[model samples]
Target: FGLIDVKCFASSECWTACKKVTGSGQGKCQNNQCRCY
Candidate 1:
């Protein structure tokens, strides 16, 4: 899946958003963006 553009102040928030959208448990926040893996 592709990365989702989300506004997050922390990694936890980014992961949560990524998991919800991409349905993947693995996720990270970089430059306030969410990447699912």
Candidate 2:
């Protein structure tokens, strides 16, 4: 539910970390990172 700059190559890369926080997570690539949700 919030924007976080995470080190990732793919959405899948950040999903594990984000999903832990939100239970369901999504990622968009930008600035060499993922804007996780």
Candidate 3:
């Protein structure tokens, strides 16, 4: 994916949104962040 695709994770709000969609324990949660799959 492009940087734009993953840039959202750089934002705390965006990262939190991703966690809500995928669930906090859905995948790897390192450094209180989520990397795009």
Q: Order the candidates by lDDT, highest first — what do you get?
A: 1, 2, 3
Off by over 4 Å in 2: none
**TM-score of each predicted structure versus truth:** 0.62, 0.47, 0.33
If ranked by TM-score, best first, what sequence of candidates would result? 1, 2, 3
True lDDT of residue 15, candidate 1: 71
Residues 1-37 of candidate 3 have per-residue lDDT tens digits of 1012333434554445556666442233344444433
State the lDDT of candidate 2 residue by residue for 1-37, as single tens digits: 5456766677676676677777566766566566665
Tally clashes: model 1.
0
Which scores better on lDDT, 1 or 3? 1
Q: Highest TM-score, which number?
A: 1
Question: Considering summed lDDT, which 10 consecutive residues are worst modelled in model 1?
Answer: 18-27
What residue runs in model 3 are displaced by over 4 Å at the alpha carbon?
1-10, 24-37
Winner on lDDT (2 vs 3):
2
